[PDB]
Design an enzyme around this catalytic site. Structure first.
Site, PDB file in Angstrom:
ATOM      1  N   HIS A 124      46.170  38.058  57.121  1.00 55.17           N
ATOM      2  CA  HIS A 124      45.524  39.366  57.229  1.00 55.17           C
ATOM      3  C   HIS A 124      44.043  39.336  56.759  1.00 55.17           C
ATOM      4  CE1 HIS A 124      47.087  39.124  53.137  1.00 55.17           C
ATOM      5  NE2 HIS A 124      46.049  39.877  52.816  1.00 55.17           N
ATOM      6  N   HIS A 167      36.946  37.941  48.138  1.00 52.43           N
ATOM      7  CA  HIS A 167      37.305  38.051  49.547  1.00 52.43           C
ATOM      8  C   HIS A 167      36.599  39.284  50.100  1.00 52.43           C
ATOM      9  CE1 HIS A 167      40.251  40.447  47.227  1.00 52.43           C
ATOM     10  NE2 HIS A 167      40.036  41.326  48.190  1.00 52.43           N
ATOM     11  N   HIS A 220      36.804  42.815  53.065  1.00 56.49           N
ATOM     12  CA  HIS A 220      37.621  43.732  53.840  1.00 56.49           C
ATOM     13  C   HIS A 220      36.662  44.200  54.923  1.00 56.49           C
ATOM     14  CE1 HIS A 220      41.101  44.234  51.128  1.00 56.49           C
ATOM     15  NE2 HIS A 220      40.224  43.967  50.178  1.00 56.49           N
ATOM     16  N   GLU A 272      36.598  49.612  51.931  1.00 55.53           N
ATOM     17  CA  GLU A 272      37.803  50.261  51.435  1.00 55.53           C
ATOM     18  C   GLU A 272      37.399  51.505  50.657  1.00 55.53           C
ATOM     19  OE1 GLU A 272      41.595  47.424  51.414  1.00 55.53           O
ATOM     20  OE2 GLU A 272      40.404  47.231  49.584  1.00 55.53           O
ATOM     21  N   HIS A 316      34.994  41.960  47.382  1.00 54.41           N
ATOM     22  CA  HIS A 316      35.748  42.130  46.144  1.00 54.41           C
ATOM     23  C   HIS A 316      35.716  40.817  45.372  1.00 54.41           C
ATOM     24  CE1 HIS A 316      38.379  45.634  47.890  1.00 54.41           C
ATOM     25  NE2 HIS A 316      37.221  46.060  47.420  1.00 54.41           N
ATOM     26  N   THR A 345      44.582  46.742  46.356  1.00 49.70           N
ATOM     27  CA  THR A 345      44.612  47.521  47.592  1.00 49.70           C
ATOM     28  C   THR A 345      45.514  46.889  48.645  1.00 49.70           C
ATOM     29  OG1 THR A 345      42.713  46.399  48.593  1.00 49.70           O
ATOM     30  CG2 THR A 345      42.258  48.277  47.139  1.00 49.70           C
TER      31      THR A 345
HETATM   32  C1  TOR Z   1      42.788  38.848  51.046  1.00 48.67           C
HETATM   33  C2  TOR Z   1      43.464  39.834  50.090  1.00 48.67           C
HETATM   34  C3  TOR Z   1      43.314  41.282  50.457  1.00 48.67           C
HETATM   35  O1  TOR Z   1      43.022  39.672  48.734  1.00 48.67           O
HETATM   36  C4  TOR Z   1      43.985  38.992  47.941  1.00 48.67           C
HETATM   37  C5  TOR Z   1      45.292  39.018  48.780  1.00 48.67           C
HETATM   38  C6  TOR Z   1      46.384  39.946  48.268  1.00 48.67           C
HETATM   39  O2  TOR Z   1      45.868  41.055  47.491  1.00 48.67           O
HETATM   40  C7  TOR Z   1      44.875  40.951  46.477  1.00 48.67           C
HETATM   41  C8  TOR Z   1      44.178  42.272  46.696  1.00 48.67           C
HETATM   42  O3  TOR Z   1      43.043  42.428  45.793  1.00 48.67           O
HETATM   43  S1  TOR Z   1      42.121  43.699  45.868  1.00 48.67           S
HETATM   44  N1  TOR Z   1      41.929  44.100  47.393  1.00 48.67           N
HETATM   45  O4  TOR Z   1      42.878  44.693  45.202  1.00 48.67           O
HETATM   46  O5  TOR Z   1      40.905  43.206  45.319  1.00 48.67           O
HETATM   47  O6  TOR Z   1      45.375  40.867  45.147  1.00 48.67           O
HETATM   48  C9  TOR Z   1      45.035  39.621  44.483  1.00 48.67           C
HETATM   49  C10 TOR Z   1      46.302  39.047  43.891  1.00 48.67           C
HETATM   50  C11 TOR Z   1      43.976  39.869  43.417  1.00 48.67           C
HETATM   51  O7  TOR Z   1      44.600  38.819  45.604  1.00 48.67           O
HETATM   52  C12 TOR Z   1      43.980  39.679  46.568  1.00 48.67           C
HETATM   53  O8  TOR Z   1      44.867  39.539  50.034  1.00 48.67           O
HETATM   54 ZN    ZN Z   2      40.261  43.402  48.237  1.00 51.24          ZN
END
Ligand code: TOR
Ligand code: ZN
Length: 256
Positions: free
Chosen positions: A60, A90, A92, A102, A115, A195
């Site tokens: 995703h 990463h 979004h 977001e 992020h 998120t």
């Molecule tokens: C690519 C994406 C969205 O970011 C990774 C993984 C799963 O979720 C996350 C989401 O972090 S966030 N979007 O709250 O900063 O939570 C962690 C576990 C911090 O890893 C992030 O998918």
């Molecule tokens: Zn994120």
């Protein structure tokens, strides 16, 4: 889980009830309702380029991981009393430049969002342990406004050709992600969550007021990444941003 019609954000509450919780992210920041907090200290980031480890296509989205065995790369200041260890960053984005970020500011949606995540190493000994704690995670969010090409994204963008399909991964070293942050670090901060599932409400968000740029073509590169496994019919990653969620009483503080 993903962002498709059948397994998207609206269906996450099925396996993760916390999705309807009182500390969910992202949120729409209303500037007329933010509270300037004089106690908020400046954000201080100090990352060691040697901690960059690898880049991974997770279907995703994709993310860059950092070695987090020590405090070579940390975050301090702001609303924190503890030091937070960098472990990943990463992005979004959306299907078009019209949306993708977001968080939103006064209803304005940006094209993407960066992020940079850290975990509380002062109280916990690992990401796994810190991930579910109310004070375990710290994430900096930077709104990305479509415009001039962002040269800082170059290394990240050039690495994508090696992790085009789901599950692929490759080393990604010698990179300091603070080079991706805006010049000014004035920020908004509120208690929120991840998120993406498991959606733990363990994140103290640090949203920069200043945006960074990204060109329409650079966004295209993100969307050209594939969510399928090598060999299957190519299915581009068109979007992976979660809708803004209810503040439910939470107060968004401003460092300015
Ligand atoms: C690519 C994406 C969205 O970011 C990774 C993984 C799963 O979720 C996350 C989401 O972090 S966030 N979007 O709250 O900063 O939570 C962690 C576990 C911090 O890893 C992030 O998918
Ligand atoms: Zn994120």
């Amino acid at each position: 889980w993903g962002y498709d019609d059948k397994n998207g954000p609206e269906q996450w509450s099925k396996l993760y009830p916390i999705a309807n919780g009182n500390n969910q992210s992202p949120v729409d920041i209303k500037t007329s309702e933010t509270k300037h907090d004089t106690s908020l200290k400046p954000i201080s980031v100090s990352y060691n380029p040697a901690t960059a480890k690898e880049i991974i296509n997770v279907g995703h989205s994709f993310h860059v991981n950092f070695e987090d065995n020590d405090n070579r790369s940390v975050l301090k200041g702001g609303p924190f009393s503890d030091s937070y260890r960098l472990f990943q960053f990463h992005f979004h984005w959306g299907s078009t430049n019209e949306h993708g970020s977001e968080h939103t500011v006064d209803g304005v949606k940006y094209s993407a969002e960066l992020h940079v995540a850290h975990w509380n190493s002062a109280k916990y000994s690992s990401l796994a342990e810190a991930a579910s704690k109310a004070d375990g995670l710290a994430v900096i969010g930077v709104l990305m406004k479509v415009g001039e090409a962002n040269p800082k994204l170059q290394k990240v963008l050039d690495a994508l050709q090696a992790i085009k399909t789901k599950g692929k991964r490759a080393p990604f070293t010698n990179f300091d992600p603070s080079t991706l942050l805006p010049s000014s670090l004035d920020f908004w901060t509120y208690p929120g969550s991840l998120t993406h599932p498991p959606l733990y409400e363990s994140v103290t968000w640090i949203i920069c007021k200043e945006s960074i740029s990204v060109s329409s073509e650079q966004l295209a590169q993100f969307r050209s990444l594939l969510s399928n496994v090598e060999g299957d019919n190519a299915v581009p990653m068109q979007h992976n941003n979660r809708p803004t969620q209810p503040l439910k009483g939470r107060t968004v503080r401003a460092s300015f």
